[PDB]
Amino acid sequence: QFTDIDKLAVSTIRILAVDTVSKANSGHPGAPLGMAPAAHVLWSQMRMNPTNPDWINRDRFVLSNGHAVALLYSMLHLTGYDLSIEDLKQFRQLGSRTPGHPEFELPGVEVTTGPLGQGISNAVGMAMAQANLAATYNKPGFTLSDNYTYVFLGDGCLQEGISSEASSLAGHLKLGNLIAIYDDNKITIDGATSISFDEDVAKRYEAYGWEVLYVENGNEDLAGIAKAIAQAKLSKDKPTLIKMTTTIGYGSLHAGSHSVHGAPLKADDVKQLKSKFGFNPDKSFVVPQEVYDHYQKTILKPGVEANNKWNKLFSEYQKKFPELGAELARRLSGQLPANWESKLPTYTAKDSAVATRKLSETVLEDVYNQLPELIGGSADLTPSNLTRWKEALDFQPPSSGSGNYSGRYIRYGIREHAMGAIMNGISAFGANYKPYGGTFLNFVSYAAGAVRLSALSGHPVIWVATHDSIGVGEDGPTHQPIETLAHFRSLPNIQVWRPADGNEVSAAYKNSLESKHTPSIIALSRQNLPQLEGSSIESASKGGYVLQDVANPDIILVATGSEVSLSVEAAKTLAAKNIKARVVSLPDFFTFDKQPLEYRLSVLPDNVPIMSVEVLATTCWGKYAHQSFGIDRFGASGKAPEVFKFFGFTPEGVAERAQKTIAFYKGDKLISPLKKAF
Template sequence: MYPPFIQPDDLLMLEKMSNTIRFLCADMVQSANSGHPGAPMGLADIACILSLHINVNPKDPDWINRDRLVFSGGHASALVYSLLHLWGFDLDLEDLKSFRKFGSKTPGHPEFGHTEGVEITTGPLGQGVANAVGFAMGAKYAQKILGKEVINHKVYCFCGDGDLQEGISYEASSIAGHHKLDNLIVIYDSNAITIEGGLDVAMSEDVSQRFIAQGWKVLKCNGHDFVSINNAFIDAKKSDKPTIIIANTRIAKNAIGLEGSHKSHGSPLGEEIIKVSKKALGFDENATFAISSDVKIRFLNVLERGELAQKIWSDELTEDIKAKICDLKNPHFANISYPDFSSSVSLATRVSNGKILNAISQALEGFIGGSADLAPSNNTHLEGEGDFPNGKNLHFGIREHAMGAINNALANYGLFLPFCATFFVFSDYMSASIRVASIMKARLFYIFTHDSIGVGEDGATHQPIEQLTHLRAIPNLCVFRPADAYENIACWQIALKANGPSAFILSRQNLPVLNPIVEAKVAKGGYILRDTPSAKITLLASGSEVHIALEGAKKLEEEGIRTRVVSVPCYDLLISQDKEYISSLFGDTKVLAIEASRGIEWYIFADDVLGMEGFGSSAKGDELFKHYGFSPENIIIRAKALLGYS
């Protein structure tokens, strides 16, 4: 009846451990007078049993073969912090007492890089489910290049009703089932409660049948019965499929008067309820943040077990494997042999980018990625590299939501530099994951092609207008829109070394290949591409509009109007430059910005912006450029008007 490591005599101690977690969480929320006590208290019994299974070393949180633990519901942060403290991570009781306070290690929702032991910033509901799939995929590819004896850890994910209602969880679960990710274990906190009340106000599907249909193993347990929970974990670890454990729980378990109530989800329980509940369970009603010595010792078994496991693992590593892990963690960018585009007269930046991706891939073993079923159009296929899990090419299917979040986890796995790709207009589907990646400063790359009205006949629904402005507004994200193949190389040289994510916005149509450009110029975001003495006007442009600006400048010069052209492959880098550099670009000239998008951000530099005032139309790309004014002739008209010429 009882597995070897749970005997009947252990149950009282497990109960004490679980209630200790519950009251730590309740005290944290009460002290902050803000937060979510219900889910942490409902999950405490499961978290207690997870402590018997999880394989981490709090003294070395970056150990590459550690189990990964993802909390998809970030509102359970009090539980996250309680566990990290009890397991021995760098989080003391004072940190728990500072929950949700400014400058603390315990913010309202867990943040990667801010709190030791937090594997990823999950943010919006559902993201964590896809993150967990990403970690599991990362482990599978790590097994391929390092060996199953080196990488054999599990990925655990706690999720709730809200996570499974968000569409991203459908997409990610489908990918996990397709790839038979047997290293993934999702614990579904099925408490049938949401903020508005009972789950039945908005959801009535059979979750188990959904996951069975997607190729998962489905287990069920009583989320407050230690033996039932433990048996589920044991069975899940033996599975040859991804596994979801549907754990029936009571929200705010053991909170007298509020157990099972939606009112416990997002508000403190109140001091009186906490006191009464503590007293009823044999705890000191007047003591807060209390952890008895016997409970502390039991939880610290996680640290002792993890230290031993890592030592055994490390002792068995060969020198070759150690060197390979080191190289994956510290890629050698100097080894990249970038393509030569000198023989090309014109080339779409999506095409030059494809050649660059392959050059990077050949030099860096950890450079992996794929597209949302658009690799032939995005030019993202890595030649000769095979398909995941035996190769570098990831096929996400038409699942942009999941693709973005999966890449966040691949970036955080610790061995990879991942990229993902789709048409630029569909980056809207990825907004949440891009934002979270930027908060984390995750090192990953977005390839967004078909970047403007140049898409052509597909029409307004497929022509990005506002997306550039949106992405440029996101802090920590470098958005590159190269004018040609050589700017594309320079952008990649910068992006690979960046401390955060980068997005490449690339053309469908061919663009003239200009002269090679040094990385240092692009590193400032913008540079003078065409200069002339005593310039009266500066034409500022990015991407496919740069060559149009050059043509316009030539015609303006023919009319005696001295014109400078500034190429801006990265707006985000340009706005970070000092006033002296900005002045060196524009001086006392009038500035006309030219970009086939909304472009309102250019007013920080420009006196006038030639951009899109509305959505596009269905026609050939070159016809649309002329129709909407992106032509040398219209540039002359706008420039003269700006200068006050008739």
């Protein structure tokens, strides 16, 4: 029941957001000024503990419309999370804790948003991840997970294909604890939504399978909002959209203009707004004691009490259910099982040639039983990507009769970007979740918005990217990656592995699965590739290593994936004409650059021409080679062996070019490419 202090709390939130922006002289005031009534009614009612932003059973909230940050920064400060008035007084300034869009890193900021469509897609991950933790561990008497996921989204989030892909998926999956409040404010940048966004959101979300509720006066009606969120929590097998109509800039002298969406309210306009709300036009960053006190009784102190009950419950759970207790206790400590690597496969030059894609399949068979925290799937290619383990159970709603919520094989359907960002949500949940998803390497580029965010945030999701090259063959150039790895090798903090054989696939799985902050893309072959006399998990784990050495080489050939194989074979050719080639396999530039310089330079030295072999774009190879053999044009639809021969990637074709590079450079001295001047 909302009293006058509930109306004083909401004026302090709107004005503190307004002051935060206008101090920085940069920012978005409109959506924070309009959603403040909702942020109050929701947080007031959210089971959280601000002294411990990591409790696993915390109600999670994602502000999908990340430009409204001053609303999250104000909510976080007033409800006793770690953020201060000086932090807010340094909004959007260099080296502050308050950047212009929310970053995962910070406390009580659950994922990082600002790309539109990303937050609501992340909250689907979080609710899936919760459905599973609860099905796995919750025993009768010990309901350890049951948190809700509350999301704030705007018109930009609904316009973007990804929220639509995600919402189709949340709907099918019956994700009943996922409440989305849509700030239906009839404005975006260009102007009004009637100019470009005018479809029936409600009829669209109902088609998906979502329950849609409505709040006619979201600017003033705390009462309404409270009853909607309340009925929304009765939605046990439907996600809910609450279409809450508000006014952009509410209170501002230009409320409803498109002008209050992304620039600070002009001085006087903040003064009239302070007056109208009962605050002083000449004072800033003012918070009444009454507000601090209110959220202390309403949120801080009961959340702590809830956290503390959850802890006693988890210890009797541990006493009762000693091994489930154990397993969850570890996932929460964030440890991978003691010595899990001992179940990763190892091969010899003696074992059969198998496509790196089938070798990926075999790892996933040996680690699913070892890691209850590994949930993953495919975006409609389970057969093609060799991405499921034989003894799996799909993540599905119990009524489907074709899986249940404890399943760990997710079927994402043809939805790459959404797969990408749901993966970040599962990851951002906690309890050591290790998410992965399979697709064809070429279409990971459809997911680029979400993949950059796994890198910026530092979320360890794994992309199992199959069909990595022209070896795809007859599907032709719409489906042969040329630029994909180059691109992702310019992205900071992502590991773009490309395993060449058995042992290079297990090292690629062990560093990805051991990663705590870098995402990963493992590019895998369609075609059969042999096992190398020289590969080993141990060496490939370094990201680049000498596969075959010669004493005193004429050339060093660095190759990745299928080309390593071709290179060894080109090296027998050159050997026969008395050229001594050293062959270096570089499975990952990331991991490799993480090595100490002395190690790297022992692989790639001074005074030796270095020529690289990779069937994709030569442009990222300048940091390791002197000359590069690669494909800088699009592919061709033919039987794959003919496509490689057509492009020249043959033992003698590589060899011929190795010869031409030796000749080109005879008599010069050559600095290693790794060496830099500053």
